[PDB]
Amino acid sequence: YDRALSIFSPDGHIFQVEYALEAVKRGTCAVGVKGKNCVVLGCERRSTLKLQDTRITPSKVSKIDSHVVLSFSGLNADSRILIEKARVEAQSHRLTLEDPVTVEYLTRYVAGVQQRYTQSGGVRPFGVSTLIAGFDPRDDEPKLYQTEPSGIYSSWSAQTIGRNSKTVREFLEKNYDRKEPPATVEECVKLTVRSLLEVVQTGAKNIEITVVKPDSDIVALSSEEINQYVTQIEQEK
Amino acid sequence: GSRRYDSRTTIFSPEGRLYQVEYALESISHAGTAIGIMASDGIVLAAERKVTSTLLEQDTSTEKLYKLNDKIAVAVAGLTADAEILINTARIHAQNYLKTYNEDIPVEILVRRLSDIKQGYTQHGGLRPFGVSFIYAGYDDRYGYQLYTSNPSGNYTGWKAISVGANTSAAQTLLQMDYKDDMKVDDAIELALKTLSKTTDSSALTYDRLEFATIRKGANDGEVYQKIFKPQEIKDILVKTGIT
Amino acid sequence: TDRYSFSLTTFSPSGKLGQIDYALTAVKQGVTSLGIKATNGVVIATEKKSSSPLAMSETLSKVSLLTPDIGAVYSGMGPDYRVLVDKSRKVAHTSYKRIYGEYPPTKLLVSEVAKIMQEATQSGGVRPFGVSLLIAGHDEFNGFSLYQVDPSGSYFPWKATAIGKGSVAAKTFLEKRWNDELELEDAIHIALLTLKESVEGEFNGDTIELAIIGDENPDLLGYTGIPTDKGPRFRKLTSQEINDRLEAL
Amino acid sequence: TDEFNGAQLKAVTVEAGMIALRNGQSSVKHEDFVEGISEVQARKSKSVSFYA
Amino acid sequence: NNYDGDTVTFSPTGRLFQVEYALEAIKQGSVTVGLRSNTHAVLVALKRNADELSSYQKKIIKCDEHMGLSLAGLAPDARVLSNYLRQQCNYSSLVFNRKLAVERAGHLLCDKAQKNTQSYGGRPYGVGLLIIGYDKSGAHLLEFQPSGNVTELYGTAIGARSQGAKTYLERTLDTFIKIDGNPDELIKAGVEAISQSLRDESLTVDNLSIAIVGKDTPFTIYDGEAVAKYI
Amino acid sequence: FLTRSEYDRGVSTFSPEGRLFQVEYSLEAIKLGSTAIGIATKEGVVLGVEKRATSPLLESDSIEKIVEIDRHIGCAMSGLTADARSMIEHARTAAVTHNLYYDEDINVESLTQSVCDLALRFGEGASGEERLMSRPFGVALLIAGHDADDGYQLFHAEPSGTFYRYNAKAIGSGSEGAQAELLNEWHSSLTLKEAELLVLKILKQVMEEKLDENNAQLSCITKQDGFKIYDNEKTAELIKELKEKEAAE
Amino acid sequence: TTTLAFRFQGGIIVAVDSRATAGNWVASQTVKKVIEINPFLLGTMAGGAADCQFWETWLGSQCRLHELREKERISVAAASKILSNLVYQYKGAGLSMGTMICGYTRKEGPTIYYVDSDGTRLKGDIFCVGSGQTFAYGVLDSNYKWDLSVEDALYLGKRSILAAAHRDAYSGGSVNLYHVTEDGWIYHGNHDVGELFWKVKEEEGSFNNVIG
Amino acid sequence: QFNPYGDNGGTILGIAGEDFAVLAGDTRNITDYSINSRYEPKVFDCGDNIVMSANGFAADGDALVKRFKNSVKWYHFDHNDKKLSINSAARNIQHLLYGKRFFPYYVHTIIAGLDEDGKGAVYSFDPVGSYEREQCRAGGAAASLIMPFLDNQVNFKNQYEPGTNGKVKKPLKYLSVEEVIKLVRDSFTSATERHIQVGDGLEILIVTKDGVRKEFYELKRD
Amino acid sequence: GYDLSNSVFSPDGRNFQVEYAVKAVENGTTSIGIKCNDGVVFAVEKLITSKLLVPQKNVKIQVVDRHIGCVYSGLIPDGRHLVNRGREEAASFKKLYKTPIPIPAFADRLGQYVQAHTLYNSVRPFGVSTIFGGVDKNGAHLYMLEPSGSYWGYKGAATGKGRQSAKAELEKLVDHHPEGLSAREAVKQAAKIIYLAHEDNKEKDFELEISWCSLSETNGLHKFVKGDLLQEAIDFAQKEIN
């Protein structure tokens, strides 16, 4: 097989990149907001279905190195091929050039990965959009990037992708400030919970929060924790 | 010539969606039901055969149930030919893991590997999917008993109670009302049987139309006895629960 | 060039795979064959057919030998049967008489041939072989066994079955005619009697081909002076033996 | 004129006395029939070429 | 589309329309004229600028110090063919220690188009080349079509308004054959030859591109204030 | 959408046009390009790009369409910028290859010609080069540069595989509006700060926000200082001194 | 032949000879055993002249292609371990390789790496590779203090090579000094080793054994 | 059993000047003790005021003349008649040498020409790969005869002003195109009598900004 | 659809593609092959398109080996590929068996190549008819090869536009001479029926090329008839048609 699954369109596009963006629209919603000394990725999980084992099943936030997290929206099945490439590149960087990867280098790699499956024959793009966030090593600047299935990469101050992202994005213009992040880690978490409660709704059990602090500390806050943070927002509102 | 007659079935729809995956999911509710129910002391796997005839030999048949290794067995529902292949791919993967680390595979790892295999066929190469759904019952020490379903797209989620195949919606409603977090294996056997008695696609529900298998902690010294039952041991526990 | 590597079998919008739905119809447009499984043996019997009556029929085989304990018989297409019998044998030698240095069990042989059908269902440049095979054989540890491999690539063990165009009627006849112990002597009379309800044709040994996986024959051994091995458990029945049984129906 | 059909050639001859009228004459010059070649043919130019 | 959109097919007529389509590459092409006498070849190509801030894109490629080719048609196609001619030209210099035979190289070219017109997913090239050179048998002018026809002519054109040049060459045919030893005249005859093939596009001192090859003068491309001597 | 296209089933198929349709579509993706303006003088070349703000929450000072090939050649991308992620690496490789083999600064024209040879390699397998692409690139470059052999040169590289040397060219969406003004205001008697201010004049007209250094970026290639990306503090000064002289009217 | 480098306060002094022999015959006496890996890395040439020279040109090719892509200058530890993975390949395809890549960056400081022909890569503050590395060591380690000043340090690069030159058969030719700073290397020219002899003979009082 | 390296002898000699450069060589070809030919150029012009000579094993030495002049072609083509400089040319030769090192060339290669200042320029290659600029450099089998005499006369190595006895160093005198003709002749006179693989003929090629001139002198017949 | 390609079949025994290839050959110029006692004599009508051409400087008879003449009509470029292929195949046989290829052997080879181009989706059957022969040591033979991959022995064959005029006149020549005629005498016969085959093609002007391979004139090599011998043929024919 060497026949195209990418047929050029007279519109100034490729159909399959437009189809791949819709597929991303229909995916679960991710928020990213970076503090002054943290990153915070909040993601919706549909836990609406009952008798779900949640212990054994991976969160929709995957660590790809000891200080770079990747969250995603769109085709869940497809995403895992990207996560396996990216973990592999992370070691290769240590092998041949030494030190851990930079968030930028890894983001670029991801960018070239999704890009490839557009331009090559025999393959269709991936309809998966990533939020790549993290720290560079020896550094303490949070750097929050977004890559999208067009194979276009971006830096962002805060971003959201997924379902009904627009509703959260308008909220984020108005409650997060370009000039000032919220400075405590805790307030940043609650700003993102407060944002999540627009579309997600339906109790606080469909909210999951991963917080990363520099020096390679990725911890994910449990349901119990969230429960306390949500109730606060609830009372104050 | 060839490009003219090319199907192109691995392109996205306007919805971003993959028609052949859905078509695969449509056709597995035309195959029999396979259910997993996780007890706290073991896992019951209960499958209803999609064939039956009095001239059938359905006694050497293990046509839904397969051992991948002595600790992780599967329930298969769908097109059996495609499924057979993955079953020996899986054996090859288990033994590989065992060659290199000299330690049995955890359930987490083998379910991720099969799923990536599926992912490849829908992702490119112009092929049609492998239309199979597996219910993995397995034991590992690291996370205990773990129960799993995977679908032809190649995506997995863990479950405490699941149903696949015919009447998925139906079996799910029932399971939610008659589940309790911790059960004995017997109570589970009972429940496994009971759900299939209300969902059976023929009125009658019989032992020779049940394949039924467990993994039990009734092996002493913290080991797990994989048991695929003989249909004459199925016959007694079906009279026990009072169905027949 | 070539660019046929895309699947030519695809899911249908209504579900089920169109190409295997087409192939199965074809099996019921063919000749008729049946197999009865006895306690102490297995029988398969089928009709021999040719274009013209002036054609031979001894130079044609629809009961074919895989191993000295395992024969196959088909219903479906002649050309498509011929190639798969050869491939059945080739894989039986390369993956089991080289690695265990003996012949495979019936269940194990079934499964191998089911993979070959399977890649005729998957991938480009193939369409399914349009046959249904019976694989009756004997191995020592599970005794007598009868299988059916279908166009789709699954297998089924049966206790008695038929395939071909006269199939729906034939399994109904054999439902009342099956018994819990049937002897091989008795079974031979049964299969003939069923295929007589299914065949109009002039009924001799020369048109009805009979093969048994009965019991071992130390005379088809080809050597003597080894008591350790025993001969073929398969034994193809030529015209003379069937002629006595014609008269005993 | 190369490969001009008789209807196009009728259409140069007419088109010359349009040009004549616009300059404002009463006699039709030999330099007008040449400019009716360009103004009326059958095709508007050799299109846009970006590498042809 | 009945039989029109596929280079492998036929065609109840017995043509195919894909070849005819490629012959429109010539038609939308810019005029170029080649004429040879017997001591000198000359290609006169009418370059084309995109706009005023822009330069002109050359239309004559030095293939060798005795061979040159000029395109008419698509610019990417031309760049594929020019590389190839050069590789087979250096092969003959290396292996047989020999200037490349002009007549032979026309058949190498032919078979390269032919194999993209045999197999599906190929294309017919949309460039027709005029290849002049001077070897051991004297001056030569090869005419290459998309079909893959190679013809040797005394003087020819391809391009838009090729007809108007070709009727000029029928007059002045008997003139140019008989001027020999005076390369200057044959150039003047080529300036005039392409004047006839203008759409009032004029000839400037960076639009007109002359290249010659002689008995004693290697392949050279003139442009600049070199051309103005002929203009 | 759904505009008549007779042929377009092959990725190279003809077409009563006399030229391929797919190449034409590639050029119609540069009219959706974020506008890149470039004024080439004999004292230097200025590459200006509108960074393009999409959101107030997007950091628009981190994203830029100035891309360095090497110190003596700069380049600007407009169109579908994912396609330029692959080519710009290739071009940087190329330059370096030349410095390895010849230890010399590569000609601007030569370098331009190399990504064109890359640009033409769409296909299902044909010609001397093995096709590895299957759809044409939908991106155009403005390779600027400085060599000490032919001076300042500025090229417009096409997805077609064609290169036209310009003396100033703007591409992008506001291309049509830009090139009316270039035609009158350009000349060869310019000086570097009168050109620089010309980039910001024309940037002002194709601006979809307003002009400030939080959505516009200037960059130069100078003979004795090389390729230099102008920072935002410096960029600001010039934008204000335009605004001083436009208020002298 | 001798190539030595020692880190000090100011950066690194590299000091190398310029005689490259073939047989007992002396080929050239004007060879530069400094290879500009870029302006901010200096590579030594020791072991086979062909092998060592070439691959460090191409290491400079990858240096510029680390540099564009990261928009950040190649680190000393990244270059070294590139070059190291390459020579492990041809480890017993019969090639040689003894370089010290010597560099100073703003976020890692001065760092020498000694990359071998077996793919051994050893960090360290002093290395000496060559057929006169035994003669070089002794004098270099006696006259060492880590805290040193630039003038003094420059003098040490000469004095150790000199000693090496005097007894070693293939050492001599000319010496060259470079002083690596963070900003780059600055080149300090060419001193003939035999005219250097008579100067330090006077100044120190050395080389009593040489008659006259 | 096969061994594909012999010797074919010959001797080459490169001298850089102040607006000239001289690359000479002999025209004797031998294999062992039999004279193949008295006349056989080894010093070929290759265009753009580069003269090359690859001396040692003849076949090898013709192999890299082949590929070098092939590169002259492809450079001018895909750079549209760009003049290839001494600096540029050097580095190309080195790539061809090195890439075969598991079947290497077994020659001593030298180029010479002018540089961009309008002074002589001479680079010399070792067998496997790498190279270094020189100002005098012989190569070949009579290399070690011509070389110490020419450093004694170009660079005046270990000579002093007279009557000072090692106090003052003799200053380096300028080099005329006429004077460097003489050195080559005198040297190759000494080469002949004391070394048995230089003879018949001497061919000096003098290269300037003005052009390439050939000049032929006889040597001894043996 | 089933009327479009080569791998298709249709229930009329037609395979419409291949039949369409004859229609290509039918646009060609007349080419004849006169089988004589001593060898074979080809001639081709070569259209003079314009007075701008350089004359007698295009050969439509190309040699394969040194003893098998080859002349083809249909698509001129397409034919040049088929001849190149039969020059490879001749050269492979010359090496492997160290003799010049027999003509029934040359027949097998070419025959196979065009047959090949009707069994794949991704190829087109070539639309050319060849006429090839010479002298080998089993004697002179002649073959005409259809685009369908059909061929037969032939005492005279033709193809082209003016295959209508040519065929009737070849009947005339086997009834003139049913005991055959000489290869020398046959030069004048090839001129005569090529000239008559330009009364289906009289919108242009043409040049006659004649070549022969006969044992008794050329020592069994494929040579061209040239100089004064060639103009005697031109005159002969020219006076009959006037």
From Swiss-Prot, chain C:
Domain of life: Eukaryota
One record GO biological process: proteasome-mediated ubiquitin-dependent protein catabolic process
Misc. comment: Present with 7060 molecules/cell in log phase SD medium.
Biological classification of the source: Eukaryota, Fungi, Dikarya, Ascomycota, Saccharomycotina
Location of this chain's protein in the cell: Cytoplasm; Nucleus
Key words of the record: Cytoplasm, Isopeptide bond, Nucleus, Proteasome, Ubl conjugation
Keyword Ligase: no
Cross-link (Glycyl lysine isopeptide (Lys-Gly) (interchain with G-Cter in ubiquitin)): K107
Record keyword Membrane present: no
PROSITE patterns: PROTEASOME_ALPHA_1, PROTEASOME_ALPHA_2
CDD domains named in the record: proteasome_alpha_type_2
Role played: The proteasome degrades poly-ubiquitinated proteins in the cytoplasm and in the nucleus. It is essential for the regulated turnover of proteins and for the removal of misfolded proteins. The proteasome is a multicatalytic proteinase complex that is characterized by its ability to cleave peptides with Arg, Phe, Tyr, Leu, and Glu adjacent to the leaving group at neutral or slightly basic pH. It has an ATP-dependent proteolytic activity.
Subunit structure and binding partners: The 26S proteasome consists of a 20S proteasome core and two 19S regulatory subunits. The 20S proteasome core is composed of 28 subunits that are arranged in four stacked rings, resulting in a barrel-shaped structure. The two end rings are each formed by seven alpha subunits, and the two central rings are each formed by seven beta subunits. The catalytic chamber with the active sites is on the inside of the barrel.
Protein name: Proteasome subunit alpha type-2
Signal peptide segment: none
From Swiss-Prot, chain E:
Keyword annotations from UniProtKB, A to Z: Cytoplasm, Isopeptide bond, Nucleus, Phosphoprotein, Proteasome, Ubl conjugation
Organism: Saccharomyces cerevisiae (strain ATCC 204508 / S288c)
Location in or out of the cell: Cytoplasm; Nucleus
Gene that produces this protein: PRE5
Complex and partners: The 26S proteasome consists of a 20S proteasome core and two 19S regulatory subunits. The 20S proteasome core is composed of 28 subunits that are arranged in four stacked rings, resulting in a barrel-shaped structure. The two end rings are each formed by seven alpha subunits, and the two central rings are each formed by seven beta subunits. The catalytic chamber with the active sites is on the inside of the barrel.
Further details from the record: Present with 7210 molecules/cell in log phase SD medium.
Family assignment from sequence similarity: Belongs to the peptidase T1A family.
GO biological process: proteasomal ubiquitin-independent protein catabolic process; proteasome-mediated ubiquitin-dependent protein catabolic process
GO cellular component, one term: proteasome core complex, alpha-subunit complex
Taxonomic superkingdom: Eukaryota
Name of the protein in its database record: Proteasome subunit alpha type-6
Positions where Phosphoserine occurs in the chain: S11
From Swiss-Prot, chain F:
Gene3D superfamilies recorded: Glutamine Phosphoribosylpyrophosphate, subunit 1, domain 1
Residues where Phosphoserine is found: S55
Pfam families membership: Proteasome (PF00227), Proteasome_A_N (PF10584)
Domain of life: Eukaryota
InterPro entries referenced in this protein's UniProt entry, alphabetically: Ntn_hydrolases_N (IPR029055), Proteasome_alpha (IPR050115), Proteasome_alpha-type (IPR023332), Proteasome_alpha_type_5 (IPR033812), Proteasome_asu_N (IPR000426), Proteasome_sua/b (IPR001353)
Modified residues (Phosphothreonine): T54
Keyword set, alphabetical order: Cytoplasm, Nucleus, Phosphoprotein, Proteasome
Compartments, record wording: Cytoplasm; Nucleus
Keyword Cytoplasm: yes
GO cellular component, one term: nucleus
Gene Ontology BP annotations: proteasomal ubiquitin-independent protein catabolic process; proteasome-mediated ubiquitin-dependent protein catabolic process
Location, primary (coarse class): cytoplasm
Coiled coil start-end: none
Family, similarity comment: Belongs to the peptidase T1A family.
Function, in words: The proteasome degrades poly-ubiquitinated proteins in the cytoplasm and in the nucleus. It is essential for the regulated turnover of proteins and for the removal of misfolded proteins. The proteasome is a multicatalytic proteinase complex that is characterized by its ability to cleave peptides with Arg, Phe, Tyr, Leu, and Glu adjacent to the leaving group at neutral or slightly basic pH. It has an ATP-dependent proteolytic activity.
Extra remark beyond the main annotation: Present with 17100 molecules/cell in log phase SD medium.
Protein name: Proteasome subunit alpha type-5
From Swiss-Prot, chain H:
UniProt keyword annotations, A-Z: Cytoplasm, Nucleus, Proteasome
PROSITE patterns xref list: PROTEASOME_BETA_1, PROTEASOME_BETA_2
Organism this protein belongs to: Saccharomyces cerevisiae (strain ATCC 204508 / S288c)
Pfam families: Proteasome
Localisation: Cytoplasm; Nucleus
Subunit details: The 26S proteasome consists of a 20S proteasome core and two 19S regulatory subunits. The 20S proteasome core is composed of 28 subunits that are arranged in four stacked rings, resulting in a barrel-shaped structure. The two end rings are each formed by seven alpha subunits, and the two central rings are each formed by seven beta subunits. The catalytic chamber with the active sites is on the inside of the barrel.
BP-aspect Gene Ontology terms: proteasomal ubiquitin-independent protein catabolic process; proteasome-mediated ubiquitin-dependent protein catabolic process
GO cellular component: cytosol; nucleus; proteasome complex; proteasome core complex, beta-subunit complex
Domain of life assignment: Eukaryota
InterPro entries: Ntn_hydrolases_N, Proteasome_bsu_CS, Proteasome_sua/b, Proteasome_suB-type
Chloroplast listed as a keyword: no
Protein name per UniProt: Proteasome subunit beta type-6
Protein family: Belongs to the peptidase T1B family.
Tagged with keyword Nucleus: yes
